[PDB]
Amino acid sequence: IGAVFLGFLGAAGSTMGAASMTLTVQARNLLSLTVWGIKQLQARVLAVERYLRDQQLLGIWGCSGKLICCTNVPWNSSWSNRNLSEIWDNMTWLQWDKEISNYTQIIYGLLEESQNQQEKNEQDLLAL
Amino acid sequence: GFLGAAGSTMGAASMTLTVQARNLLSLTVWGIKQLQARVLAVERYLRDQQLLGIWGCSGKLICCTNVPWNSSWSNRNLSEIWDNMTWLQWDKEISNYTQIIYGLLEESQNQQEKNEQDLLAL
Amino acid sequence: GFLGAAGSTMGAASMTLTVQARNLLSLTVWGIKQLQARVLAVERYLRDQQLLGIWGCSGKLICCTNVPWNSSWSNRNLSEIWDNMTWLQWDKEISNYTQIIYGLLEESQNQQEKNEQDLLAL
Amino acid sequence: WVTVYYGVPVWKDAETTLFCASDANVWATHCCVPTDPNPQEIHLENVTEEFNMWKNNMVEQMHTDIISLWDQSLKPCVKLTPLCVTLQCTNVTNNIGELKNCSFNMTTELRDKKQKVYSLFYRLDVVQINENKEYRLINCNTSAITQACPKVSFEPIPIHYCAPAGFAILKCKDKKFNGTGPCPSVSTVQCTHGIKPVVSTQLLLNGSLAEEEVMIRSENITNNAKNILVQFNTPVQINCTRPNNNTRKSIRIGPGQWFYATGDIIGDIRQAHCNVSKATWNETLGKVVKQLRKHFGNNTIIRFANSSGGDLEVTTHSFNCGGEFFYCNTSGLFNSTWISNNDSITLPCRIKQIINMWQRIGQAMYAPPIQGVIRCVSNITGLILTRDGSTTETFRPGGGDMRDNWRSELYKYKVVKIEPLGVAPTRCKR
Amino acid sequence: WVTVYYGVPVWKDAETTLFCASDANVWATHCCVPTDPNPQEIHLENVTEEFNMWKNNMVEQMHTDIISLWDQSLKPCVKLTPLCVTLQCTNVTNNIGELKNCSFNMTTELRDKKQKVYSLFYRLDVVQINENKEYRLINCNTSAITQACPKVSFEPIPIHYCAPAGFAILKCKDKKFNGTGPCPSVSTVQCTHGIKPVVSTQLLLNGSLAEEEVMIRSENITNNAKNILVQFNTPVQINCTRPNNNTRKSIRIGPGQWFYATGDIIGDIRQAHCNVSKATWNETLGKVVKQLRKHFGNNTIIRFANSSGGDLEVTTHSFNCGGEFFYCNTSGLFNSTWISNNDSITLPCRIKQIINMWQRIGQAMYAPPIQGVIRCVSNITGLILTRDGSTTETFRPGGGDMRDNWRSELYKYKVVKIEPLGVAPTRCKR
Amino acid sequence: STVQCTHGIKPVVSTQLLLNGSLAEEEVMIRSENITNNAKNILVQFNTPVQI
């Protein structure tokens, strides 16, 4: 027990295999009298744009509506040659994000194409 | 009409949900008020969409969940609820439990996604 | 390559749907104007997304419905439409039926959700 | 048999706000977005579109925004309404009167004290009232006059206009496009090329050149109520100067309130002027005539006459260079008849300090004196001409709207909005 | 094997704009965003992060907002530029010199009327012009002078800063953190503690205390160009006064335009001053030395000397109390050499009314007279010291930027951008 | 009923009499927050115009 809730960032220092259980905690907190209030309107708008860019990508990749989604894109090894027994158990998400930061755009490009192929194939089947 | 279903019973009203949903977001000084109003409408819209996403009801006006009703929230018969009450009356009837029901929905969806990953990993 | 498909025929052009979609979200004088521009871009994005939600095509760039083409909207052969026309020409060709098709997509989705609820209750 | 598609490559003509960007004080900063050093352009294969430079709202924004920034830049500056006093005045010493030597009773840092102040003025900013003689500043019966801050540059630094998300700018690659109608070769950009917000009247001194041939464009050509814009395919060199070594002094007129006055002139007093390559100018007009004849007849005689009467702002060529506002006679440039089958032109110029910059009433800007000697070299890139309206077709240089100075760069660009959602019949069903 | 995750607990350092918040007129009506009556603080288990108080943008924002609010607060107030006249002036009424008795011819509600008025002034705000004698207000040659509205308080009511959605603040719990580098124990908050927007020079009058030991922080220590900020682990009691029962009168100078003038003094005329507990002060300097030696050598002699010359804002200890501006001679506090192996200190203080609040040029604020007798009580929580730069290390008090009075509370906080989207390999595939 | 917008209302300034607003549909209406409490005002709406 231990009343484990952890909190908004929660166990940011925990490993990935422990940390990816609080994904919803963070998601629920991302949206949260005269003049010069434009500073806050600017802040509100930018928060909205950040939210939408993330949601659009989940949409494009076919992972919309999920906190965790499997894809059919292979891990190409050069991105990280660590074992899953090392990645999920002895690393935090922050360490991981740094570990593979240089491949962010590679993975994202591959994800977009995979989804493009999947939708194309579904239409061919529905047209059958 | 946008609120035409407002006096309808729940079993009658929950067919017009699209009518209401589709109308929810729709040079000088004071232009800031106009901008503020637009921003706030967006925020309201997004909070609802986020929760539907979180609960696994994204893209639907009606979604069944796998969460049971726990009775204490309301002990009325479903036929009483759907045929002899309107949504406005109902909203008041179970107002205080909103956070309980939502907490249960959120927990359930997380368990469901966890199980989906375990199966896709098998 | 955002508008690279602009002169392509529809059957060639609908491959770059992702390319365009991913590029849609991208003081006094020069102060307020840029905030206004961001807000309006957001509203445009959301209205399209809400409709895809309403029609059951959320999360997709290509989705099939169960609405038939009614012929009278366009009596062109599908081989003429997809191979000898561009999307711009096409959009103009049937522009006056936009609201008809959209209304049908909406009604169909409502019927589908109603039937699914009845089945999940069975 | 219906499929809904999103990301569909279609658009509709639309009007939105464009934002400035720049190649990273001067008015040109003010938070413009650093631009893209390696901008992309998408050629659109098999895409044509209709363009109209006369209905181009990109021009309308350029106009609107330049004025707004111009005004914003004067907000923190010292007002010269305290100078609306009676002045005693005579001529500036020379041997035998463009410049006036005037004096007055001015305020000081203390409200209860006075000082004697004298300065040099152009006669064009001063009006005689007592028909020394008594004079007043020529704008005291109509406007507030604000001194431009001496630290702020109005140099026409080029900026790029960029579309907001949801929008794109379509552009022509048709080197023969006349500013209107279908454009056979279209490409698209997020941002336009950098455009210098040059303000002028009769001549265009720092724009783009035509790609191949002199291009003559008009809303109509045949309609005598409309202007004809001429884009050169070659520059003409023009050298302008203010050949007077001037000094400046500051007067403390109040608590941190300074007025900048012309002190005196070192050396000779000479008239301002511009030098235009003579040979180049004649060759240039010959090219213009060959192209004008396309709409008037191959053997039609074309005459270039000088301007009509009126205020200097509409009868002369004017520009802002070195901080001074020059008005040039230009008649030496439009004094010839072209009939089918090294040297220079010296144009005298006048200088003014109180400027009704946007042809509005009540808002006058005062240009503080510039010390030293001014030398400016510009590229004549084009002209604004009108028809003087039977075998001879006479044209005259003239002014026009400020918008005409910018549509000359923006004629190749159009703004459209993107509409990614749409449907088509297919053979699939859920 | 790619799996996409959203809600990932990661972040990047980022610069954003924080907003103020308040727990139930300057500051006082700045309701900002109402605060959380019971804010949550989340300890981050296993988490460490690096901080740098010298590069903290939060400090820059307090400067930006504090300065802006004070300028905004004067926007609707009566201008005193109408008082920029010559004054006839003599002494007041005392035996045997800070105060002056000066008179002038002032405007009234009508432009056709004038009035003889007079008031008391402090020497520091008045300068002789006729090198009775003739004087002018000292700032009338270079700046606008605006009267603060008499109804508006500037009491430094603590406010909180909070991150916007998408951002969060990391906070140190490290009692020994020296301002830079890894902070072994952190937590996350949405909002900082309330901080009083206090302005001071040499002494830090109302901040937080160190938890255990006096903390000495500097961007460098070795580099003598940097300041040393000393945070005490116990407050020093200071009692300041302006022991003169003053009266005030209003003068109508125009249509609804009022000027507030010092009337007269009831009773004796005495110097403003501050009383610092002597015993406490000696103990705190000894504590400071024990800790300073960690950077200079265990047996290195440390000496406290007085300030260097310059403007009162850098030579004296200044503060706003009761609406009056005090300039205290702190040399009485720094007279000691510390060599290895009840009472009070009275500091005289000067009083000024025309204040360049942010040490800027052209914007002077006039502090209207405060009636009655002023008493101020505060907790000195720290010092701003510099090295006077071989067996003795000498330090002197001095002034510095207002930013240094804020980083003194902000060193424990950092703001980061939350980045919830990311990927990792797993054993699943669609 | 539900509306998105109100009827047009004249932003008229007056004291003792209201000279260009709406008329009551059937009968003169008298409205007050309280009536009994004399600190409250009574607003009287006519069902007929009176020309001035």
Ligand SMILES: *[C@@H]1O[C@H](CO)[C@@H](O[C@@H]2O[C@H](CO)[C@@H](O[C@@H]3O[C@H](CO[C@H]4O[C@H](CO)[C@@H](O)[C@H](O)[C@@H]4O)[C@@H](O)[C@H](O[C@H]4O[C@H](CO)[C@@H](O)[C@H](O)[C@@H]4O)[C@@H]3O)[C@H](O)[C@H]2NC(C)=O)[C@H](O)[C@H]1NC(C)=O
């Ligand atoms: C059409 O386009 C042309 C070409 O772009 C413009 O002509 C240029 O305009 C700029 C702006 O006026 C001119 O630059 C000015 O030069 C003056 C002298 O500089 C000398 O010393 C520098 C030292 O490095 C040399 O590089 C330079 O060649 C000269 O030797 C400066 O004094 C001007 O302003 C600076 O000094 C003043 C002094 O008080 C400051 O107040 C200013 O802030 C600033 O510091 C300025 O730099 C440039 O020389 C022009 N070139 C030509 C060929 O004329 C045309 O003006 C434009 N047409 C119109 C009508 O605008």
Ligand SMILES: *[C@@H]1O[C@H](CO)[C@@H](O[C@@H]2O[C@H](CO)[C@@H](O[C@@H]3O[C@H](CO[C@H]4O[C@H](CO)[C@@H](O)[C@H](O)[C@@H]4O)[C@@H](O)[C@H](O[C@H]4O[C@H](CO)[C@@H](O)[C@H](O)[C@@H]4O)[C@@H]3O)[C@H](O)[C@H]2NC(C)=O)[C@H](O)[C@H]1NC(C)=O
């Ligand atoms: C460090 O922290 C300390 C402690 O918070 C600050 O010291 C306080 O500073 C405030 C503001 O200067 C002091 O408050 C003032 O007290 C005066 C006297 O109050 C007594 O007498 C009045 C007489 O009517 C009674 O009403 C009151 O209840 C007390 O009995 C007030 O006169 C001051 O002004 C008030 O009245 C005027 C009337 O027009 C209003 O306009 C004002 O807005 C306000 O209402 C004011 O209240 C407080 O007493 C100080 N505390 C101590 C212990 O001295 C330090 O200033 C702070 N240091 C720094 C550098 O910020």
Ligand SMILES: *[C@@H]1O[C@H](CO)[C@@H](O[C@@H]2O[C@H](CO)[C@@H](O[C@@H]3O[C@H](CO)[C@@H](O)[C@H](O)[C@@H]3O)[C@H](O)[C@H]2NC(C)=O)[C@H](O)[C@H]1NC(C)=O
């Ligand atoms: C007209 O222009 C002249 C300058 O071009 C303005 O300034 C005047 O210049 C003359 C010559 O420098 C000054 O005369 C001086 O007289 C004293 C007398 O002893 C002599 O010692 C000096 O060597 C010099 O000769 C004259 O005073 C000066 N005027 C002022 C007011 O300073 C003149 O003011 C201009 N007039 C107007 C109406 O603007």
Ligand SMILES: *[C@@H]1O[C@H](CO)[C@@H](O[C@@H]2O[C@H](CO)[C@@H](O[C@@H]3O[C@H](CO)[C@@H](O)[C@H](O)[C@@H]3O)[C@H](O)[C@H]2NC(C)=O)[C@H](O)[C@H]1NC(C)=O
């Ligand atoms: C210098 O300060 C004094 C006050 O401290 C200023 O006011 C002057 O005060 C004296 C003494 O109260 C006044 O004289 C008295 O006037 C009354 C009038 O009926 C008379 O009955 C008394 O016998 C005595 O004469 C004096 O008038 C008063 N002056 C004014 C203008 O009010 C004095 O003005 C200050 N001087 C300056 C330059 O500021």
Ligand SMILES: CC(=O)N[C@@H]1[C@@H](O)[C@H](O[C@@H]2O[C@H](CO)[C@@H](O)[C@H](O)[C@H]2NC(C)=O)[C@@H](CO)O[C@H]1O
């Ligand atoms: C499975 C996979 O994609 N592996 C990647 C490697 O293919 C890639 O190196 C390849 O090197 C070739 C050398 O000429 C390139 O031509 C080739 O394009 C490149 N492949 C790709 C996909 O870029 C290495 C490079 O770091 O990364 C692997 O992940």
Ligand SMILES: CC(=O)N[C@@H]1[C@@H](O)[C@H](O[C@@H]2O[C@H](CO)[C@@H](O)[C@H](O)[C@H]2NC(C)=O)[C@@H](CO)O[C@H]1O
């Ligand atoms: C795709 C489509 O049908 N759009 C409609 C337009 O075609 C229609 O234009 C009108 O079509 C008539 C057909 O004979 C023409 O007679 C009529 O002149 C023409 N009107 C114009 C302005 O060109 C318009 C207007 O009825 O509605 C569109 O929805």
Ligand SMILES: CC(=O)N[C@@H]1[C@@H](O)[C@H](O[C@@H]2O[C@H](CO)[C@@H](O)[C@H](O)[C@H]2NC(C)=O)[C@@H](CO)O[C@H]1O
């Ligand atoms: C392309 C276009 O529409 N051009 C317009 C000209 O056609 C129009 O021509 C004028 O038509 C009148 C019809 O009765 C004639 O009387 C008149 O002489 C004729 N003028 C010219 C210059 O052709 C002109 C002026 O109305 O405007 C053009 O925009």
Ligand SMILES: CC(=O)N[C@@H]1[C@@H](O)[C@H](O[C@@H]2O[C@H](CO)[C@@H](O)[C@H](O)[C@H]2NC(C)=O)[C@@H](CO)O[C@H]1O
């Ligand atoms: C720095 C200073 O002098 N502050 C003043 C206090 O000294 C002063 O004296 C306080 O009197 C109380 C009466 O019993 C004592 O208990 C208290 O210890 C004593 N404070 C000190 C620091 O010795 C108070 C008046 O009561 O006013 C302060 O401004």
Ligand SMILES: *[C@@H]1O[C@H](CO)[C@@H](O[C@@H]2O[C@H](CO)[C@@H](O)[C@H](O)[C@H]2NC(C)=O)[C@H](O)[C@H]1NC(C)=O
């Ligand atoms: C404007 O001034 C420039 C600079 O002096 C002139 O250009 C020079 O022309 C002479 C003519 O033989 C050449 O030898 C120089 O090399 C030119 N200078 C440069 C830098 O190229 C220009 O011709 C003048 N224009 C006019 C119309 O007089």
Ligand SMILES: *[C@@H]1O[C@H](CO)[C@@H](O[C@@H]2O[C@H](CO)[C@@H](O)[C@H](O)[C@H]2NC(C)=O)[C@H](O)[C@H]1NC(C)=O
């Ligand atoms: C921080 O690190 C410690 C040490 O690795 C973690 O402690 C282990 O936690 C697991 C459960 O996640 C237990 O089964 C182990 O017995 C713990 N080991 C020790 C030695 O404590 C800790 O969970 C990590 N995360 C925190 C504490 O937030």
Ligand SMILES: *[C@@H]1O[C@H](CO)[C@@H](O[C@@H]2O[C@H](CO)[C@@H](O)[C@H](O)[C@H]2NC(C)=O)[C@H](O)[C@H]1NC(C)=O
């Ligand atoms: C400071 O001056 C004021 C007057 O400006 C004094 O107020 C006096 O208060 C007593 C209290 O009963 C009254 O009877 C007097 O009439 C008041 N004086 C006046 C002129 O009205 C105040 O007491 C003085 N304070 C100090 C500390 O000396």
Ligand SMILES: *[C@@H]1O[C@H](CO)[C@@H](O[C@@H]2O[C@H](CO)[C@@H](O)[C@H](O)[C@H]2NC(C)=O)[C@H](O)[C@H]1NC(C)=O
């Ligand atoms: C602070 O007070 C000291 C003490 O009065 C001032 O310095 C004194 O100046 C006199 C003038 O001859 C000397 O005799 C004293 O020896 C000086 N004392 C010291 C400690 O130097 C000092 O100038 C005042 N400083 C400020 C900023 O007001």
Ligand SMILES: CC(=O)N[C@@H]1[C@@H](O)[C@H](O)[C@@H](CO)O[C@H]1O
């Ligand atoms: C500085 C100045 O010119 N002041 C003159 C003054 O000398 C002259 O006596 C008066 C009319 O006689 O007019 C003032 O403007």
Ligand SMILES: CC(=O)N[C@@H]1[C@@H](O)[C@H](O)[C@@H](CO)O[C@H]1O
């Ligand atoms: C100061 C000034 O020039 N005032 C002019 C006047 O000279 C001119 O005669 C009149 C119209 O002719 O318009 C006034 O504004």
Ligand SMILES: CC(=O)N[C@@H]1[C@@H](O)[C@H](O)[C@@H](CO)O[C@H]1O
């Ligand atoms: C680019 C171009 O040449 N546009 C038009 C052309 O389409 C039109 O036909 C002609 C007059 O008929 O006038 C030209 O300006």
Ligand SMILES: CC(=O)N[C@@H]1[C@@H](O)[C@H](O)[C@@H](CO)O[C@H]1O
């Ligand atoms: C208070 C004051 O300065 N008053 C003087 C007045 O005594 C003098 O008589 C007049 C000119 O003679 O100028 C006024 O400013």
